[PDB]
Amino acid sequence: NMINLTTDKAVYQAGEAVHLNLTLNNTTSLAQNITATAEVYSLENKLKTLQYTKYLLPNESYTTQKGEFVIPANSLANNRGYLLKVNISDSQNNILEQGNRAIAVEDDWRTFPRYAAIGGSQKDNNSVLTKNLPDYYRELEQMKNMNINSYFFYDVYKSATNPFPNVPKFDQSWNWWSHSQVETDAVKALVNRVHQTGAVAMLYNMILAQNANETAVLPDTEYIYNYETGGYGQNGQVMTYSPLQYYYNPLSKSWQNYISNAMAQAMKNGGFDGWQGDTIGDNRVLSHNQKDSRDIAHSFMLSDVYAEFLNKMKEKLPQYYLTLNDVNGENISKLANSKQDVIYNELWPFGTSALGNRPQESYGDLKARVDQVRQATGKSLIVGAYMEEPKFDDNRIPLNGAARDVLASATYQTDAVLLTTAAIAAAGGYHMSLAALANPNDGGGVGVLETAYYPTQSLKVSKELNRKNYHYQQFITAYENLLRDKVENDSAEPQTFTANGRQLSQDALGINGDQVWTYAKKGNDFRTIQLLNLMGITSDWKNEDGYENNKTPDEQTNLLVTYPLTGVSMAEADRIAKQVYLTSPDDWLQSSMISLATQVKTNENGDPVLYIQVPRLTLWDMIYILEH
Ligand SMILES: OC[C@H]1O[C@H](OC[C@H]2O[C@H](OC[C@H]3O[C@H](OC[C@H]4O[C@@H](O)[C@H](O)[C@@H](O)[C@@H]4O)[C@H](O)[C@@H](O)[C@@H]3O)[C@H](O)[C@@H](O)[C@@H]2O)[C@H](O)[C@@H](O)[C@@H]1O
Numbered sequence: 001n002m003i004n005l006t007t008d009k010a011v012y013q014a015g016e017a018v019h020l021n022l023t024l025n026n027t028t029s030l031a032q033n034i035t036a037t038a039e040v041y042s043l044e045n046k047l048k049t050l051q052y053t054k055y056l057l058p059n060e061s062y063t064t065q066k067g068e069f070v071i072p073a074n075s076l077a078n079n080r081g082y083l084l085k086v087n088i089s090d091s092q093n094n095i096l097e098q099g100n101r102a103i104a105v106e107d108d109w110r111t112f113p114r115y116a117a118i119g120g121s122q123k124d125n126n127s128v129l130t131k132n133l134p135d136y137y138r139e140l141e142q143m144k145n146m147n148i149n150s151y152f153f154y155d156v157y158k159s160a161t162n163p164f165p166n167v168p169k170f171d172q173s174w175n176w177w178s179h180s181q182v183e184t185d186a187v188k189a190l191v192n193r194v195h196q197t198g199a200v201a202m203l204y205n206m207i208l209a210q211n212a213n214e215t216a217v218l219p220d221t222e223y224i225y226n227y228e229t230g231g232y233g234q235n236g237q238v239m240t241y242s243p244l245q246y247y248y249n250p251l252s253k254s255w256q257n258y259i260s261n262a263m264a265q266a267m268k269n270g271g272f273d274g275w276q277g278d279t280i281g282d283n284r285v286l287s288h289n290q291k292d293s294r295d296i297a298h299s300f301m302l303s304d305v306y307a308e309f310l311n312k313m314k315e316k317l318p319q320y321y322l323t324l325n326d327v328n329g330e331n332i333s334k335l336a337n338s339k340q341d342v343i344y345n346e347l348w349p350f351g352t353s354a355l356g357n358r359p360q361e362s363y364g365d366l367k368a369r370v371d372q373v374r375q376a377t378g379k380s381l382i383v384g385a386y387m388e389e390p391k392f393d394d395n396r397i398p399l400n401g402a403a404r405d406v407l408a409s410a411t412y413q414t415d416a417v418l419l420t421t422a423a424i425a426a427a428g429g430y431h432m433s434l435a436a437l438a439n440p441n442d443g444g445g446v447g448v449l450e451t452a453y454y455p456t457q458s459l460k461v462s463k464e465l466n467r468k469n470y471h472y473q474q475f476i477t478a479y480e481n482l483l484r485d486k487v488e489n490d491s492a493e494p495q496t497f498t499a500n501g502r503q504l505s506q507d508a509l510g511i512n513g514d515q516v517w518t519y520a521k522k523g524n525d526f527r528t529i530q531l532l533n534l535m536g537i538t539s540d541w542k543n544e545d546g547y548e549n550n551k552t553p554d555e556q557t558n559l560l561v562t563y564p565l566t567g568v569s570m571a572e573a574d575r576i577a578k579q580v581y582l583t584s585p586d587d588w589l590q591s592s593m594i595s596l597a598t599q600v601k602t603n604e605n606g607d608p609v610l611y612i613q614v615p616r617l618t619l620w621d622m623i624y625i626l627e628h
């Protein structure tokens, strides 16, 4: 629509007023009063109705000014998501335009992280440049209105041991493919704009690395050595990425001191709020004093000392946020007690699934990883799950279907991206998918991460995907309390049927496609049922095949969902049955919430069972059931 609803910030403290600006357009041929109505909802409850009316001539528009739409300080509870439902109507109450916008109120980003990337521009050798600020700014306005509360600044650093010096420009000289440069004033402008929105800025940097094209900052007593000759060189040899990088022992007091101090100054120079920690990978290793030993009990695994290393960084950088990418997410058990402010895992389909002996290649393996992290830590997993990743050989020969799409100048497959975002969010996580890259292929909106090198956008973001990403972000914010606020897997097993009794929910794990993937969650006060549409489609989350493997599932209508009230008396069942709602970020609802027709019956076991009527399922529905 053209409401161009905007807020003054991405996120609010409870003691803050929300300033809304919206445009009333007389898109009719008649001069008349045009009314904007904004209903404030907290889940199913309408808290307030705001409104504003102006007489407008045909084609005349008016953007509200500071003060005309305001949610006053202290009217909303802390650490909650709200939904503003906006309608612009004419003087006969016809609806001319409509749009829904979430509002996030929170102390800070760590409870419900909604993390987006910022990186260099492909059209400029991947550089971060002052001249690209207008495009970054337009992208950041969109991110702000999607309630983004944090940004991962990808490759804005000089070298791993000298991350952000006070110089006007440096060369990421380690970058041989594009010879990117960083203008530091551009990085600072971006950090400042992020801060105006109320968001935080995280600096990406490795935690153990010393670049190739530079000199050792410490002597070799502080390096880490290979136990076994393999991918990183010979046993008794300094742990070497190949020749590009060596690595220090995480138990080296001198390295800990060095990198903590280097990062303290870098973050201070940029105005960064914390450190997005990275590592390449795990290795069995020896200290310098053990480097000639062959006794495996004198060796150790890197991931085994990550926690203690992070705890040192936290102690040494107390005012800064901290997280460490656990590639594939395999070490939560070792990292559970570490002083990370948020949990971040980059997930690849070839990693081992939290479900056990299978690759994490399906939507259900994404849920399993989110769940495993919540069980271990109480926190919402931020997931890096890059979409499609078109790959070519050395002669531009497409190696997957997504690369064939690239050659056809095609778009990301919209529903493939949305389905992965839904899978992660429905489980209680957050899919870090959106990027501000000043990249032409994003068509004026935000980009979708496609590969570990964030700046790369080989496919175009259609206007459809851009608009639906926006709806999805609103849904993820507005319903955060239902998705990931003291919300756990439910032992009760809902199922989904066609209006004729054909069972559609076939695999609650979400490993298999061609189903309505159906499972329940429980909160203190309520139950939810996630329905994810995989009818007629496969369950692979990455869609490496692009459009060769269609990811638009068969739309469903008039579904029946059953939900057993295992504990419950027949008394509360008829109460509960009157308080069943559904919401969806898909076009038919766009986070609006509707009342569902429900009957109570009794199942094979003897419990009461809700028979819930679901009008429509496009990609993702959430049923919400109040139990008090
Ligand atoms: O034109 C050639 C080529 O350009 C792009 O790929 C370039 C390379 O990008 C990546 O390597 C650069 C990357 O290396 C380190 O980190 C690697 C990796 O580590 C993970 O833990 C993290 O989650 C990732 O996001 C991260 O990239 C540095 O720490 C980092 O600063 C630096 O950016 C990638 O690993 C290489 O394979 C690529 O060669 C285009 O993407 C590609 O189309 C094109 O072929």
Ligand SMILES: OC[C@H]1O[C@H](OC[C@H]2O[C@H](O)[C@H](O)[C@@H](O)[C@@H]2O)[C@H](O)[C@@H](O)[C@@H]1O
Pocket: 032, 033, 034, 035, 053, 054, 055, 090, 091, 092
């Ligand atoms: O009188 C008809 C008129 O009444 C309402 O609006 C009243 C009034 O509201 C504001 O003060 C505006 O600035 C004025 O132009 C309006 O007349 C209804 O909202 C409207 O639809 C209707 O035309």
